[PDB]
Design a binder for these strands. Structure first.
Ligand SMILES: [Mg+2]
Ligand SMILES: [Mg+2]
Ligand SMILES: [Zn+2]
Lengths: 39, 94, 16, 1114, 222, 104, 263, 83
DNA sequence: CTTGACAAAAGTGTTAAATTGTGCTATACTGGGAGCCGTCACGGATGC
DNA sequence: GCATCCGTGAGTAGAGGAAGCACAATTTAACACTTTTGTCAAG
């Protein structure tokens, strides 16, 4: 979000989960969202 | 965006340290009634009121502008907490 | 009789 | 304003009564008008003949006839007094002493049967309600293939819901056919023996297929007598019960042979006979006669199963989603089912009451306790899933709700356990269920709407009309036929050209079992009546439907229900032809019964002198509040002395103009971006709409208060409220209620009420306060009803019901109840939601003055500005064609009727635009005005874009733009023209029920929860906004640790924190550091109630008391 | 006896207690079979258990039998009159000593409490507990104005004399929490009963004069 | 001191009886007429605390002066009413009963 | 067991579960004292065991326990602490908050990237404790209680109350929220601008991050209170400070449908 | 060893986070018997207790930062080092 | 201001009375009533 | 392997929401009656 080295103390785990799960509604749905879920 | 936000972020190693310094400075300003400010009378933030131009009551705005000047020293274990509060009370009665 | 049915279990017990 | 009608298809039959699904079904169930001795064995008459006679096994309680009396109160009285519009039910029963041989007859009061209003709805507890028809799997015998093992089929026998167990016949791999009842599998060989079947009988009938019969020839139990085989079967089904012949025969009889417990149903019996090719004597799996079991359906079911597995040509599997296999339970069947269940409970109570207490001197009145019957009926009409609050925002809203089909409800599917197959459009929905109309989201495909021409038959199967085609000519003979019957014919399309009645096209587009095919005129056997039968009433109101994507046509039809009535509502310029029929069948307007003359016209009533001479006075519903708060009023449309014919309109109903459905306004629409105020579906409107009172609606809000009895004393509804000035009590009359006609704002008192204060000594500071001022504390406190924030208007009605009033059944402890009706006239404002019939919706984001809106060269400003970017992604091109047709009709002063899929085409729209240009620009030439300089510039830019042919005169180029629906549009701010021609026309826009006035809410502090001490939820309760898990995740990702902590503790449930934070803020200080939430304290105590020692520790593992020493025993 | 508030097994166990009592009091000298006499005790036990354990808010037997009798009379009138009877008709049929008020009070008493977890609507996300505010704990506004009143009262009492402020804070119970009496206040300062009510009145009068001059305390009176 | 760790563990019968301020011996909740909680019931003031701050059941002590005191006439401790959210009781089972969590 | 707005009583399902356990426990004590036979005692002990199980976890073993007169299972301790409607997910991981509002959103093109259109009536209620202090500071009201009483009635609010309101919100920011909050930019800090009306004005450039169009969306407004909360919102959560997507690093507040078309 | 997100989250060292996710009966049963102690390391546990989450401004790296101006800092240092 | 009165609010028994808890009823009666498939589908753990 | 059991399935908002009696035992309201408090003079 800033194009600079990550600041110490950022909850990157929550950001990681939100980043992956945000476009989930855009998946086509072994292909699409079910493929992601099993992976 | 907040004025001088790029300069504010570059003065700290972590963006959350900047927020802590600004928030702590704002309460120091609020606790002593803005009498411990490092801003000269021509540098005090102002707001436009119907009566006229008056001092900004938002201490966060004051704290951000004070940090831009560079007259504030921030860091860890600068002074003891109890010694800091008592000395500020003595120099700035409230 | 039925372990999961207490009423049927009681009726079996009194039937002895 | 003449109406030009497009279309070439000649509809041979009109639309059936749109509410006949609700009205005719309930009439058949009640049968209140047919004489008792001519009543057929259907409806609640079938319920009486089924449960009765009740036999003690020598007392017999026989049923002879029933009748329904007049309702105790009229419909208006029930609504005003919160009553149920119902009719008392009396049954004529006779008690037969089989010992003595004496009959005593009397009429017993079985309770109250709720009555259906003429429009097709019910008044339950003073509220209008609609019973939604339910779709489910039709009962009968079905043969589905086994998915686990290919080439195998399973026989399923389904009775009526809650009328017997499902019967599963499956060929096991071992070869023996198994039967599953109540999750218990057992060999069908045993039960087949129980019904008197030998070894040679089975081989003589089922032995002509192959190895299948050999699996049904187990001789170990064939020689076994039916009696012990019945006992052996009885032990298998329920193990543990002592084996007794009398108990065993009763259980088997009750399982498959008892009409009172097992009911295949009229639809189920008909399907079983039609599928298996047999003739059921009754509606049960077996008949129990002469002390022995005789087979009805197991052998024909098993015969079909064996033949289907063998592979004979005449046997096929059944599609359970096929609409011939799915039936509709209307209000009549649902009410009868609940009536039958309640009657069974009454029958059980009678049976157990007639076995004790003065056996000789018993009367049918004493034995019959009618409370279980009334309770079951009351439960169905109040707390059923299919008994829904009537949606009456506008007459179309109520009309749709009655024609809705729901797969949910008691006995149907589940909202979350429903797969894609039950939610999908089957091929048999063509002409019977609308494909596009459905609630998008979690209810998509589960709630559907009946088609316009579709009707439900006696058995519950939806039928659709088709025109008989013989020898290539299309006749006027219309056949209503079900999906299973429809699959046997080649049905053409309604758009096939006809030269009179003979089919002219050599290649006819037809359907064979739902598949599109191309056939010759001589291969056509049936034809569609019209394109309107495929869609519902709501979808049929969308002009140019063929140019709209289905996903957006779904939104357009659904939003037509949400349109509010307007005080100046106008029928759309472009219509489809159902606008008159929707109003006529909604019973919202008033029509003349026969030819006559109007004697008296008034805003309150109309008196018409009919030809026969009788004077009929029709009271007019005026400013009535609907279930959604909208004002439903009827405005007279006749004058004194006017001659009216039969069916002539007398008074418009809500949202109707001269008998035509008017859900919105016809406004001049310009399709162009405007300074970002059109951004992302936002809508720009002119201030001229507000000046002439367009999109202005009247909404009525109801406020209720009750004066209760309390231990300390009775609450008094009075004008004398303690500690209030005269300004607060200015609008209250001497009775304490606000006067009618007073304007009320938030915080204003609607009715003054005082309640006795609970006995409690005051705080010492208050005692000193009263001591200083010398004021004695009173015994009553202000508990009056005030206007909630964001509400108000004009008090138009005050309803005061007092204890003991005739028909007012106030709850115990309530002396009186006062209802205040506050009506406000809402104008269109920023944030209000506008929409059209083509799925284009948006909120008004800007209201511009008349001098800022773009205007035509003649000086006419546009009313609404639409963003063109919303068209390409949604693919709803019908609004563009409506805009083009509206532009042509705006300057020609005419309206149009373009039926869906057969209406105005572009050549017909363009020929109208050519005439509209001759009055648009030809008038300018007559006035002595040439071509504008600004117009010349736009034409120069337009010819660079290829919109006009180069080399033509400016007038000819302007005509070319006009034929495309585009005009030279000027900017009201700069005066310079828009650099390109803009599509400007007249479009019908509706104002939806969703308004920002009823959705804005804010709260600083308010009511808190009981256990968790967290703020409540909802605007009505003045609650806070739910900060759920995802919101907490957002703060965690941002790193806002202190912002999150405040919301978790300071602003939600930190009782010490929130009290100190509010106190600190009002003192001008910063809020203090928060503490442990009360919810965590609740969690700890609830964990301790589970015998779990949850202890909060410190850095040194020592216990830390978070309860402040209030939970530690000394 | 099923469907009257107690489960089937609860009815059996209560009847078992009656059966045990029947055995203790049974006499075989009368030549009557056991089932004839045991049926009384078993039915008595089941009915008493229903009258004592079928309601969350327990109602005595005498009032329960009154409620049951009231329901029976209402049903008989309802089936005879073809409509729900009014309180006057129910009271008249009940007998002497019964009026519409007593019938209404008994019906109000016979109201079972409603569960806090009963859902409303098809959506299983709303219950009664979500719509019932907590009116016991003071609101943040109520706690604030109480603190505002306390700080303004202690400031107003400063203008008083050292003893006069003490007397009012002691006579109005601002110190120990409880209101004291003139004799009790007298023991604190060694002063007689009569003198204190005069200095208490005089101190009260001075506060009235100060408030009338400043009006910084009227708003808290509501 | 600040909370740093949260420990969950089994509660012994001795510990459960240590949490409880009194045994609930009757299923009565409140008096149906006076609406006051019944003695020894699920809402007994003698076990879980007073309904209102600094006031016993019998109405003899009604102020904060007698804080931390138990009235001899009624048995209700004169303290804050918020203790009714934090004070637990216990039921002495005639026979032991297994905890369903550690079974199913 | 609380009396409600009227006169009737409302009680939780735990009281019913507790009552049955006490009724069965007391009856077992009586049965044991009477020397009842083993079958009666065994049945009572089994019923006592089931009563404990229903209280701790209803429906886990056997048929769920239902209130007579209805088929709804009683809510046990396990049901209270578990599920989407349990204590954790409904009251601990998420809560309802004070100083929170909600209204329909409309597009504001004249707003800056860090600004939002907050209605006056919403801001009056949201910033009420701050407003009451400000009115006390000026001559609008004598004290806080008089100020609050003045704001109770709409017709009793003078024109100087609004003037104090803008002084209150000067520099402060509010959090705009649209559900579902799929990513972290579903909540953003904006500087409120008092506007006439009832709808929130949303900047066009933040629509994509919020996934918010103007066909009838609604948003939640939250007011951070202290200096720590204001500093976090103004520095970290400000809309003009979050311009790049944390998922990919590409710009998230960028020109959109009408802006791209015009350029 | 490889496990899914559900199994990995349910087998975490903190019972408070695991109980609030899924298998509340199972997680609490195992934690109570084992006498598990939650050190409150992640974000969910602090949210449940209403504490300051150990991320962002609540992280130990930046939480203890002190701000002071020239005049007070010199006054504190001068009045202390003078001894 | 201490002293002596006086009218009224409050604490203290006393008792007829509503109000509540307990016991008992003797022809003989002796193992329940309700339900019932678009049963929801898919992993995952444990048993055997 | 193969059954069997068990837990899971987006987020805000809205509007709509059938015994009866006798008799002893334990509260409870009414009634006096006596302190016990508030009060009002002697100058
Ligand atoms: Mg929807
Ligand atoms: Mg949207
Ligand atoms: Zn006491």
């Amino acid at each position: 979000s800033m194009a600079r080295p990550v600041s110490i103390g950022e909850a990157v785990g929550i950001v990681a989960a939100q980043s992956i799960g945000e476009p989930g509604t855009q998946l086509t749905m072994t292909q699409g969202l079910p493929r992601v879920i099993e992976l | 965006a907040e004025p001088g936000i790029d300069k504010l972020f570059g003065m700290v190693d972590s963006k959350y340290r900047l927020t802590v310094v600004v928030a702590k400075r704002a309460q120091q300003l609020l606790r002593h009634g803005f009498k411990n400010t490092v801003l000269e009378p021509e540098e005090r933030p102002k707001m436009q009121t119907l009566e006229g131009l008056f001092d900004d009551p938002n201490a966060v705005t004051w704290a951000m502008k004070e940090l831009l000047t560079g007259r504030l020293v921030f860091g860890e274990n600068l002074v003891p907490e109890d010694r800091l509060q008592k000395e500020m009370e003595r120099l700035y009665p409230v | 009789i039925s372990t999961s049915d207490p009423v049927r279990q009681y009726l079996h017990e009194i039937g002895q | 304003m003449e109406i030009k009608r497009f279309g070439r298809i000649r509809e041979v039959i009109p639309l059936p009564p749109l509410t006949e699904i609700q009205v005719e079904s309930y009439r058949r169930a009640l049968q209140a008008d047919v004489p008792p001795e001519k009543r057929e064995n259907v409806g609640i008459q079938a319920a009486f003949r089924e449960t009765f006679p009740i036999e003690e096994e020598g007392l017999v309680l026989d049923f002879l006839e029933y009748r329904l009396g007049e309702p105790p109160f009229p419909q208006d009285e029930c609504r005003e007094k919160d009553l149920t519009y119902q009719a008392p039910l009396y049954a004529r029963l006779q008690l037969i002493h089989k010992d003595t041989g004496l009959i005593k007859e009397d009429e017993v009061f079985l309770g109250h049967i709720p009555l259906m209003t003429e429009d097709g709805s019910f008044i339950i507890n003073g509220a209008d309600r609609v019973i939604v028809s339910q779709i489910h799997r039709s009962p009968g015998v079905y043969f589905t293939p086994d998915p686990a093992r290919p080439g195998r089929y399973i026989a399923s026998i389904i009775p009526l819901p809650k009328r017997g167990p499902w019967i599963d016949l499956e060929v096991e791999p071992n070869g023996v056919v198994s039967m599953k009842v109540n999750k218990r599998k057992f060999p069908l060989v045993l039960l087949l023996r129980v019904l008197g079947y030998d070894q040679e009988t089975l081989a003589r009938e089922l032995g002509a297929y192959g190895e299948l019969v050999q699996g049904l020839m187990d001789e170990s139990v064939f020689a076994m007598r039916p009696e012990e085989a019945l006992i052996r079967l009885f032990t298998l089904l329920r193990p543990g019960d002592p084996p007794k012949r009398d108990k065993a025969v009763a259980y088997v009889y009750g399982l498959i042979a008892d009409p009172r417990r097992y009911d295949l149903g009229e639809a189920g019996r008909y399907k079983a006979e039609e599928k298996l090719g047999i003739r059921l004597s009754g509606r049960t799996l077996a008949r129990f006669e002469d002390g022995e079991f005789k087979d009805e359906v197991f052998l024909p079911t098993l015969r079909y199963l064996f033949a289907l597995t063998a592979g004979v040509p005449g046997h096929e599997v059944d599609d359970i989603d096929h609409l011939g296999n799915r039936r509709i339970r209307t209000v009549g069947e649902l009410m009868t089912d609940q009536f039958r269940v309640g009657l069974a409970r009454l029958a059980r109570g009678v049976r157990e009451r007639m076995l004790m207490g003065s056996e000789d001197s018993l009367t049918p009145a004493k034995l019959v306790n009618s409370r279980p019957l009334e309770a079951a009926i009351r439960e169905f009409f109040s707390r059923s899933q299919l008994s829904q609050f009537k949606d009456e925002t506008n007459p179309l809203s109520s009309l749709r709700h009655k024609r809705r089909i729901s797969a949910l409800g008691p006995g149907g599917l589940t909202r979350e356990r429903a797969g894609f197959d039950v939610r999908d459009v089957h091929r048999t929905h063509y002409g019977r269920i609308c494909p596009v109309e459905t609630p998008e989201g979690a209810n998509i495909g589960l709630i559907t709407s009946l088609a316009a021409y579709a009707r439900v038959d006696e058995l519950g199967f939806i039928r659709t009309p088709y025109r008989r085609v013989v020898g290539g000519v299309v006749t006027d003979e219309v056949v209503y036929m079900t999906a299973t019957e429809e699959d046997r014919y080649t049905i053409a399309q309604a758009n096939t050209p006809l030269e009179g009645n003979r089919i002219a096209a050599e290649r006819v587009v037809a359907r064979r079992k739902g598949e599109p095919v191309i056939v010759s005129p001589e291969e056509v056997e049936f034809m569609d009546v019209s394109p309107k039968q495929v869609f519902s009433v709501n979808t049929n109101l969308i002009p140019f439907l063929e140019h709209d994507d289905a996903n957006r046509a779904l939104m357009g039809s659904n939003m037509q229900t949400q349109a509010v009535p307007l005080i100046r509502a106008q029928a759309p310029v472009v219509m489809t032809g159902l606008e008159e029929r929707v109003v006529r069948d909604s019973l919202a307007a008033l029509y003349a019964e026969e030819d006559g003359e109007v004697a008296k016209v008034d805003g309150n009533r109309i008196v018409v002198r009919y030809e026969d001479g009788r004077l009929v006075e029709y009271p007019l519903r005026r400013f009535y509040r609907s279930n959604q708060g909208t004002a439903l009023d009827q405005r007279p449309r006749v004058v004194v002395g006017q001659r009216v014919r039969k069916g002539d309109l007398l008074a418009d109903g809500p949202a109707s103009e001269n008998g035509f459905l008017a859900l919105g306004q016809n406004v001049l629409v310009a399709i162009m971006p405007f300074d970002g105020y059109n951004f992302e579906d936002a809508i720009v409107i002119s201030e001229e709409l507000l000046k002439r009172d367009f999109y202005t609606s009247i909404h009525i809000e109801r406020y209720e208060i009750e004066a209760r009895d309390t231990k300390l004393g009775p609450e008094r509804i009075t004008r004398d409220i303690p500690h209030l000035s005269e300004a607060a009590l200015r609008d209250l009359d001497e009775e304490g209620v606000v006067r009618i006609g007073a304007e009320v704002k938030p915080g204003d008192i609607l009715v003054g009420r005082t309640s006795f204060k609970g006995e409690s000594e005051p705080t010492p500071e208050e005692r000193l306060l009263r001591s200083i001022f010398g004021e004695k504390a009173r015994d009553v406190k202000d508990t009056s009803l005030r206007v909630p924030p964001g509400e108000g208007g004009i008090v138009v009605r005050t309803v005061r019901l007092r204890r003991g009033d005739p028909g007012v059944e106030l709850k115990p402890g309530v002396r009186e109840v006062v209802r205040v009706y506050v009506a406000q006239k809402r104008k269109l404002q920023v944030g209000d939601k506008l929409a059209n019939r083509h799925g284009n919706k948006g909120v008004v984001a800007k209201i511009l003055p008349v001098e800022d809106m773009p205007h035509l060269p003649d000086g006419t400003p546009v009313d609404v500005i639409l963003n063109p970017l919303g068209v390409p992604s949604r693919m709803n091109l019908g609004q563009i064609l409506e805009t083009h047709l509206g532009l042509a009709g705006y300057f020609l002063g005419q309206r149009y009727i373009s039926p869906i899929f057969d209406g105005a085409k572009e050549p017909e729209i363009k020929e109208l635009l050519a005439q509209a240009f001759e009055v648009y620009f030809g008038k300018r030439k007559g006035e002595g005005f040439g071509v504008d300089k600004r117009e010349v510039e736009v034409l120069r830019r337009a010819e660079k874009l290829g919109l006009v042919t180069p080399g033509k005169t400016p007038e000819e180029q302007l005509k070319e733009l006009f034929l495309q629906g585009k005009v030279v549009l000027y900017d009201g701010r700069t005066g310079e023209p828009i650099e390109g021609p803009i599509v400007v026309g007249q479009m019908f826009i509706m104002k939806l029920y969703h308004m920002v006035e009823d959705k804005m809410h804010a709260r600083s502090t308010g009511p808190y929860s009981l256990i968790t001490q967290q703020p409540l939820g909802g605007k009505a309760q003045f609650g806070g906004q739910r900060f759920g898990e995802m919101e907490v995740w957002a703060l965690e990702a941002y790193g806002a640790a202190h912002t999150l902590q405040e919301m978790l503790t300071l602003k939600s449930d930190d009782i010490e924190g929130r009290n100190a934070a509010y106190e600190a803020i009002i003192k001008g200080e910063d809020v203090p550091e928060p503490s442990v939430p009360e919810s965590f304290r609740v969690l700890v105590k609830e964990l301790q109630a589970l015998a779990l020692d949850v202890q909060t520790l410190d850095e040194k593992d020592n216990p830390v008391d978070i309860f402040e020493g209030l939970a530690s025993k000394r | 006896y099923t469907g009257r508030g107690l489960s089937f097994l609860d009815l059996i166990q209560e009847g078992n207690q009656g059966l045990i009592r029947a055995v203790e009091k049974f006499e075989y000298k009368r030549r009557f079979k056991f089932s004839t006499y045991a049926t009384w005790w078993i039915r008595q036990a089941i009915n008493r258990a229903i009258a004592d354990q079928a309601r969350t808010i327990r109602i005595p037997v005498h009032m329960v039998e009154t409620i049951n009798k009231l329901s029976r009379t209402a049903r008989q009138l309802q089936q005879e009159l073809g409509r729900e009877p009014t309180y006057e008709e129910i009271a008249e049929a009940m007998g002497p000593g019964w009026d519409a008020k007593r019938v209404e009070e008994t019906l109000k008493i016979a109201q079972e409490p409603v569960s806090l977890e009963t859902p409303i609507g098809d959506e299983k996300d709303s219950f009664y507990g979500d719509f019932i505010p907590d009116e016991h704990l003071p609101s943040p506004v109520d706690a604030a104005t109480q603190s505002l009143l306390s700080e303004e009262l202690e400031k107003a009492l400063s203008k008083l004399s050292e003893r006069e402020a003490m007397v009012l804070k002691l006579r109005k119970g601002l110190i120990d929490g409880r209101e004291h009496t003139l004799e009790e206040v007298g023991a604190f300062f060694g002063v007689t009963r009569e003198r204190i009510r005069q200095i208490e009145n005089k101190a009260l009068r001075k506060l009235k004069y100060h408030e009338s001059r400043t009006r910084k305390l009227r708003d808290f009176l509501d | 001191k600040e909370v740093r760790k949260v420990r969950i563990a089994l509660a012994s019968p001795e510990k459960i009886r240590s949490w409880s301020y009194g045994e609930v011996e009757k299923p009565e909740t409140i008096n149906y007429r006076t609406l006051k909680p019944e003695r020894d019931g699920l809402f007994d003031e003698r076990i879980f605390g007073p309904i209102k701050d600094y006031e016993c059941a019998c109405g003899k002590y009604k102020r904060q002066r007698f804080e931390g005191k138990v009235c001899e006439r009624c048995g209700v401790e004169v303290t804050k009413s918020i203790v009714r959210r934090y004070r637990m009781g216990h039921i002495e089972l005639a026979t032991p009963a297994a905890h369903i969590w550690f079974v199913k | 067991m609380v009396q409600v707005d009227g006169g009737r009583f409302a009680t939780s399902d735990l009281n019913d579960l507790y009552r049955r356990l006490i009724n069965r426990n007391n009856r077992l004590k009586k049965l044991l004292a009477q020397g009842a036979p083993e079958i009666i005692i065994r049945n009572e002990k089994r019923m006592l065991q089931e009563a404990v199980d229903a209280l701790l976890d209803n429906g886990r073993r056997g048929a769920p326990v239902t209130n007579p007169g209805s088929d709804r299972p009683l809510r046990s301790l396990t049901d209270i602490l578990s599920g989407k409607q349990g204590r954790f997910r409904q009251n601990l991981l998420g809560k309802r908050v004070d100083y929170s509002g909600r209204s329909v959103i409309v597009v504001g093109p004249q707003l800056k990237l860090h600004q939002c259109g907050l209605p006056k009536r919403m801001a009056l209620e949201l910033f009420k404790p701050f407003l009451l202090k400000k009115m006390e500071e000026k001559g609008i009201a004598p004290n806080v209680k008089a100020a609050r009483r003045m704001l109770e009635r709409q017709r009793d609010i003078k024109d100087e109350v609004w003037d104090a309101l803008e002084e209150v919100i000067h520099g402060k920011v509010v959090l705009l929220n649209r559900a579902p909050t799929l990513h972290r930019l579903g909540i953003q800090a904006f500087q409120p601008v008092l506007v006439e009306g009832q709808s929130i004005q949303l900047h066009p450039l933040v629509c994509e991050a919020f996934n918010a169009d103007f066909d009838g969306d609604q948003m939640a407004v939250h007011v951070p209170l202290s200096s720590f909360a204001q500093a976090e919102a103004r520095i970290q959560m400000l809309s003009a400070h979050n311009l790049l997507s944390p998922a990919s690093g590409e710009p998230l507040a960028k020109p959109s449908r009408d802006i791209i078309l015009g350029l | 060893l490889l496990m899914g997100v559900t199994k990995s989250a349910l087998s975490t060292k903190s019972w408070l986070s695991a109980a609030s996710f899924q298998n509340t009966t199972h997680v609490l049963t195992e934690a109570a018997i084992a006498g598990k102690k939650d050190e409150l390391i992640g974000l969910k546990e602090n949210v449940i207790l209403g504490r300051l989450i150990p991320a962002g401004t609540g992280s130990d790296f930046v939480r203890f930062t002190q701000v002071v101006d020239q005049k007070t800092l010199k006054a504190i240092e001068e009045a202390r080092k003078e001894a």
